[PDB]
Design an enzyme around this catalytic site. Sequence first.
Site, PDB file in Angstrom:
ATOM      1  N   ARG A  49       0.828  -1.191   0.000  1.00  0.00           N
ATOM      2  CA  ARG A  49       0.000   0.000   0.000  1.00  0.00           C
ATOM      3  C   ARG A  49       0.861   1.239   0.000  1.00  0.00           C
ATOM      4  NH1 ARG A  49      -3.808   1.104   5.277  1.00  0.00           N
ATOM      5  NH2 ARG A  49      -1.813   1.790   6.174  1.00  0.00           N
ATOM      6  N   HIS A 530     -12.284   9.800  16.804  1.00  0.00           N
ATOM      7  CA  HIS A 530     -12.227   8.423  16.351  1.00  0.00           C
ATOM      8  C   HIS A 530     -11.962   7.666  17.602  1.00  0.00           C
ATOM      9  CE1 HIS A 530     -11.021   4.852  13.832  1.00  0.00           C
ATOM     10  NE2 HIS A 530     -10.228   4.633  14.869  1.00  0.00           N
ATOM     11  N   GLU A 531     -10.887   8.012  18.294  1.00  0.00           N
ATOM     12  CA  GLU A 531     -10.527   7.192  19.445  1.00  0.00           C
ATOM     13  C   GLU A 531     -11.569   7.226  20.543  1.00  0.00           C
ATOM     14  OE1 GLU A 531      -8.186   5.379  18.598  1.00  0.00           O
ATOM     15  OE2 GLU A 531      -7.373   6.713  16.982  1.00  0.00           O
ATOM     16  N   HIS A 534     -14.537   5.073  20.074  1.00  0.00           N
ATOM     17  CA  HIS A 534     -14.179   3.669  20.336  1.00  0.00           C
ATOM     18  C   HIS A 534     -14.509   3.291  21.778  1.00  0.00           C
ATOM     19  CE1 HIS A 534     -12.250   1.639  17.006  1.00  0.00           C
ATOM     20  NE2 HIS A 534     -11.424   2.642  16.765  1.00  0.00           N
ATOM     21  N   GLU A 593     -14.563   0.135  13.596  1.00  0.00           N
ATOM     22  CA  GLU A 593     -13.812   1.239  13.027  1.00  0.00           C
ATOM     23  C   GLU A 593     -14.711   2.093  12.095  1.00  0.00           C
ATOM     24  OE1 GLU A 593     -10.798   2.254  13.834  1.00  0.00           O
ATOM     25  OE2 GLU A 593     -10.483   0.548  15.166  1.00  0.00           O
ATOM     26  N   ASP A 597     -15.376   6.116  12.791  1.00  0.00           N
ATOM     27  CA  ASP A 597     -15.196   7.147  11.777  1.00  0.00           C
ATOM     28  C   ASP A 597     -16.361   8.171  11.799  1.00  0.00           C
ATOM     29  OD1 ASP A 597     -13.420   4.989   9.343  1.00  0.00           O
ATOM     30  OD2 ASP A 597     -12.607   6.429  10.688  1.00  0.00           O
ATOM     31  N   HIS A 658      -9.981  -1.803   9.923  1.00  0.00           N
ATOM     32  CA  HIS A 658     -10.471  -0.728   9.078  1.00  0.00           C
ATOM     33  C   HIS A 658     -10.990  -1.233   7.733  1.00  0.00           C
ATOM     34  CE1 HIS A 658      -7.162   0.192  11.752  1.00  0.00           C
ATOM     35  NE2 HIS A 658      -7.799   1.310  12.056  1.00  0.00           N
ATOM     36  N   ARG A 664     -13.659   4.608   3.749  1.00  0.00           N
ATOM     37  CA  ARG A 664     -13.785   5.233   5.030  1.00  0.00           C
ATOM     38  C   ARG A 664     -14.406   6.583   4.742  1.00  0.00           C
ATOM     39  NH1 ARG A 664      -8.749   3.719   8.811  1.00  0.00           N
ATOM     40  NH2 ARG A 664     -10.026   5.035  10.165  1.00  0.00           N
TER      41      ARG A 664
HETATM   42  C1  LIG Z   1      -5.133  -2.071  15.180  1.00  0.00           C
HETATM   43  C2  LIG Z   1      -4.321  -0.851  14.729  1.00  0.00           C
HETATM   44  C3  LIG Z   1      -5.149   0.435  14.833  1.00  0.00           C
HETATM   45  C4  LIG Z   1      -5.480   0.762  16.292  1.00  0.00           C
HETATM   46  C5  LIG Z   1      -6.243   2.085  16.400  1.00  0.00           C
HETATM   47  C6  LIG Z   1      -7.635   1.992  15.760  1.00  0.00           C
HETATM   48  S1  LIG Z   1      -8.880   2.407  16.996  1.00  0.00           S
HETATM   49  C7  LIG Z   1      -7.772   2.997  14.666  1.00  0.00           C
HETATM   50  O1  LIG Z   1      -8.765   3.070  13.961  1.00  0.00           O
HETATM   51  N1  LIG Z   1      -6.788   3.862  14.548  1.00  0.00           N
HETATM   52  C8  LIG Z   1      -6.974   4.837  13.499  1.00  0.00           C
HETATM   53  C9  LIG Z   1      -6.174   6.082  13.822  1.00  0.00           C
HETATM   54  C10 LIG Z   1      -6.656   7.116  12.840  1.00  0.00           C
HETATM   55  C11 LIG Z   1      -7.921   7.637  12.973  1.00  0.00           C
HETATM   56  C12 LIG Z   1      -8.392   8.563  12.069  1.00  0.00           C
HETATM   57  C13 LIG Z   1      -7.600   8.986  11.027  1.00  0.00           C
HETATM   58  C14 LIG Z   1      -6.323   8.451  10.874  1.00  0.00           C
HETATM   59  C15 LIG Z   1      -5.860   7.508  11.779  1.00  0.00           C
HETATM   60  C16 LIG Z   1      -6.583   4.265  12.178  1.00  0.00           C
HETATM   61  O2  LIG Z   1      -7.347   4.375  11.266  1.00  0.00           O
HETATM   62  N2  LIG Z   1      -5.428   3.620  12.054  1.00  0.00           N
HETATM   63  C17 LIG Z   1      -5.084   3.064  10.765  1.00  0.00           C
HETATM   64  C18 LIG Z   1      -4.093   3.976  10.053  1.00  0.00           C
HETATM   65  C19 LIG Z   1      -4.468   1.747  10.952  1.00  0.00           C
HETATM   66  O3  LIG Z   1      -3.974   1.542  12.020  1.00  0.00           O
HETATM   67  O4  LIG Z   1      -4.438   0.820  10.003  1.00  0.00           O
HETATM   68 ZN   LIG Z   2      -9.997   3.005  15.324  1.00  0.00          ZN
END
Ligand SMILES: CCCCC[C@@H](S)C(=O)N[C@@H](Cc1ccccc1)C(=O)N[C@@H](C)C(=O)O
Ligand SMILES: [Zn+2]
Length: 696
Positions: A49, A530-531, A534, A593, A597, A658, A664
């Site tokens: 990617r 986002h977090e 969760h 996820e 979003d 995701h 997304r």
């Molecule tokens: C298992 C690994 C990911 C752990 C975090 C989860 S809650 C998550 O969705 N993280 C987001 C962080 C984020 C949020 C909004 C915008 C950008 C990035 C996430 O999407 N992580 C992606 C990049 C990933 O870990 O694959």
């Molecule tokens: Zn997340």
Amino acid sequence: GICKSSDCIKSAARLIQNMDATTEPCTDFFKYACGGWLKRNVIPETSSRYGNFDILRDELEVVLKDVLQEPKTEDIVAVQKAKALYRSCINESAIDSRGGEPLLKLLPDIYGWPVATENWEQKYGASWTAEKAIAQLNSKYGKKVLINLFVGTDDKNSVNHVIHIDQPRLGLPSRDYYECTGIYKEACTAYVDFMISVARLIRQEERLPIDENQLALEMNKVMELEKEIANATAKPEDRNDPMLLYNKMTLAQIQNNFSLEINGKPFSWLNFTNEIMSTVNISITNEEDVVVYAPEYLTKLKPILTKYSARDLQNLMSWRFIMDLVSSLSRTYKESRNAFRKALYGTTSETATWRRCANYVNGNMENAVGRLYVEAAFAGESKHVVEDLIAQIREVFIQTLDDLTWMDAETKKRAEEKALAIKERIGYPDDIVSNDNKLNNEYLELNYKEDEYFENIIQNLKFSQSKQLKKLREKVDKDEWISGAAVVNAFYSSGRNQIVFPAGILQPPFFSAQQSNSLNYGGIGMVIGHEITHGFDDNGRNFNKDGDLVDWWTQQSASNFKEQSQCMVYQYGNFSWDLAGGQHLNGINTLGENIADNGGLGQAYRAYQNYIKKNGEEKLLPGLDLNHKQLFFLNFAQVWCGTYRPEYAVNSIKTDVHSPGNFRIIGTLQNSAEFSEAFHCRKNSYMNPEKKCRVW
Ligand SMILES: CCCCC[C@@H](S)C(=O)N[C@@H](Cc1ccccc1)C(=O)N[C@@H](C)C(=O)O
Ligand SMILES: [Zn+2]
Ligand SMILES: *[C@@H]1O[C@H](CO)[C@@H](O)[C@H](O)[C@H]1NC(C)=O
Ligand SMILES: *[C@@H]1O[C@H](CO)[C@@H](O)[C@H](O)[C@H]1NC(C)=O
Ligand SMILES: *[C@@H]1O[C@H](CO)[C@@H](O)[C@H](O)[C@H]1NC(C)=O
């Protein structure tokens, strides 16, 4: 009345340059927003990617390079090891010198690798057991095979650690592969071809004779073994509610209800739990409590393991350790493993050695690497604008439940309870600049010999596992972080009720003190929600203000949640993905996820409107005939520009939690009133469908 600020002028030129002018926002906002990122760019041969998110990670690695590779005469012992570590990891001549010898040094620790032994049965098989064999892997090398037994924070009591038993991870990316036909044909052929290549060198090195037909033979049995183990494993769909998952037990009933006859033992859970944990001579009797995540996986294995030799199994288990070790040795071993990563990841080359290598110490020594990145890299007042931003998004999250109609107000109000109870983490432990001792102290069992990459690899392993086993009877360290600083993601925990935002995200395009705030709320802002959100997705909804799995939902408020979130299930589920041969996403494996979003974006808009109210509208930036309101969405969108090689899309669609970035965006935009208002979108514009999924 356009701002003409360099840090204004800068952003403009990033935005337009990614966007293609000539598409209708309301017809495909991904192409709107990303269309000229796509045009100009091509996945690199070492990517599976590529895209902005990745390119940010690629740029973390340079800085890590700028900051690992130059000795500093005043470095404290802790820095000095990473760098040793690092330098040790980039010396290929040295790693090649050594050919294979470093596992040969091992095999015999792990009771060997049958398909590359003379007379296996007689060298180890007298001794071999289940419990030690499997247990040695777990304990020294913390590779977990056949029966995954770990230690984690306990879901009922989140000061307290306990032991879990679970099904094993597997050789291929997911259980789907072991179908081993159609779009998994290759991968499957290449996985045992790989077992083979590797078994072959091993012997060559041993100056033993090659019987390619008996290899073809051993290695394909091993496959049949994992196939059966694969089929016995529980889908991700049925693992995804932590009330069905959590079944707590004493080795006692465990020994009673899930007995296993391996080699003709049969199997003794008190043996093998003790034959691990007495790796800090901690003591374990048949009334140990134990959380079992895969009841059925073990029901299901007896019938399997029943029919396999002591040798049958160690060829699998040993070849599942040896898999990973292989890239820690000479080219000639690394080579072994081309076709298998092209089959899985689509790549025709590996990534730069300094890269893999930066990343290894960053991962093994996060705090110590943490330190250096912030000094190079991250600005510090930062930490303070975020917190408030976070403030902001907290309230708005509070704001909103009042306005959500699908809950009853006992539930509305506890929810509040998790609310203000969320603890936030920003940048890095001040620890790690402040306090040399602790730092030196957490690495002190470490000592690295620069001509000894394997040996350090192997240390570092035995480290962390014992670091992990250490923990049964200790209280959760309140103080500890889940991310190195060193990292471009952000996180949420259930145990902790914690939101984490590593310095690694604390940077453009999500945030700079300096760009317009439109893009800040577009960016880190949507990330903070986002977090937090969760918080309450289908996982964290079941967790209370303290980490603890306890049910705080009105009966009917539950059924409503499911009722609402089922809508997302069906939306993203009818997304089909060209890059994956038209296959449909998996809308359950993605609920969490996706759900977060949609919550977070809106969460964040609202935070930004509020900013409207109290601060008033802000000067526009050159180049772009759009208003801030839309820029908000612009930046949100542009976060996720990029694409995917076919092979890894297949893989992603089954292994990521995701959604892919393009959905997304469209799923979430399709669901945003604030959206299709911003961009003045005809009803039942594809970005503007009447039915709109909402929960938070
Ligand atoms: C298992 C690994 C990911 C752990 C975090 C989860 S809650 C998550 O969705 N993280 C987001 C962080 C984020 C949020 C909004 C915008 C950008 C990035 C996430 O999407 N992580 C992606 C990049 C990933 O870990 O694959
Ligand atoms: Zn997340
Ligand atoms: C690599 O290790 C080799 C052999 O042990 C040594 O000669 C050389 O100095 C090392 N290279 C560097 C620059 O670390
Ligand atoms: C576990 O039992 C095995 C045989 O079941 C024995 O050889 C081994 O030493 C035992 N280990 C412990 C710690 O009980
Ligand atoms: C497609 O979405 C629709 C909308 O209701 C849903 O009914 C159907 O189940 C979905 N199909 C899939 C693949 O789930």
